[PDB]
Design a binder for this molecule. Structure first.
Ligand SMILES: O=[As]c1ccccc1
Ligand SMILES: [Mg+2]
Length: 176
């Protein structure tokens, strides 16, 4: 379908673009065009409107935080994350296209494993226990907030999983 193609092309990585402007800028473009926001290291204010992204020095701005709320990001769009070195915070909220496979894909990016400190996943209806468990690879994670994830059926086992795998993790659960 047309809408399927559209979502796919919103997400697809253009490697030429990564070459031309660097990973952080290319990923900023992906996020904003898909209804997400980013905040750079060194900045208080967030980037929220695509057309207002900095023109700036080549590859100077580095993503520190991502807030994807009511966003169409999914699956291979996360390949934009591969070259990002400094991402510390990610919120996924009302991301209706995200699945366990998205979280798996994220969890396997070594660059994110090294940097990630805080994650929030809220009202993403497809996400299950499998996808949450994958996040244990984010070995430096200090805070994880899960809310309104109807696919997460075994919260107690998640609590115990993280207790051993990430003993210093602050886990906040707003789950039925
Ligand atoms: As955005 C975004 C792009 C395609 C389809 C749905 C949402
Ligand atoms: Mg948004």
């Amino acid at each position: 379908s047309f809408w399927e193609w559209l979502n796919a092309v919103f997400n697809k990585v253009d490697h030429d673009r990564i070459r031309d402007v660097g990973p952080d800028r290319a990923a900023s473009e992906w996020l904003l065009r898909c209804g997400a926001m980013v905040r750079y290291h060194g900045q208080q204010r967030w980037q929220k409107d695509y057309n207002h992204l900095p023109t700036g020095p080549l590859d100077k701005y580095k993503i520190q935080a991502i807030d994807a709320t009511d966003s169409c990001i999914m699956s291979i769009g996360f390949d934009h994350m591969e070259g990002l070195q400094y991402v510390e915070k990610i919120r996924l909220c009302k991301c209706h296209y995200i699945e366990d496979g998205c979280l798996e894909r994220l969890s396997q990016l070594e660059n994110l494993q090294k940097s990630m400190l805080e994650m929030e996943i809220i009202s993403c209806g497809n996400v299950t226990d499998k996808g949450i468990i994958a996040l244990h690879h984010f070995r430096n994670l200090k805070y994880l907030f899960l809310s309104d994830l109807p696919g997460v059926k075994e919260k107690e086992k998640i609590v115990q999983a993280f207790k051993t795998s990430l003993p210093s993790l602050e886990l906040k659960l707003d789950l039925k």
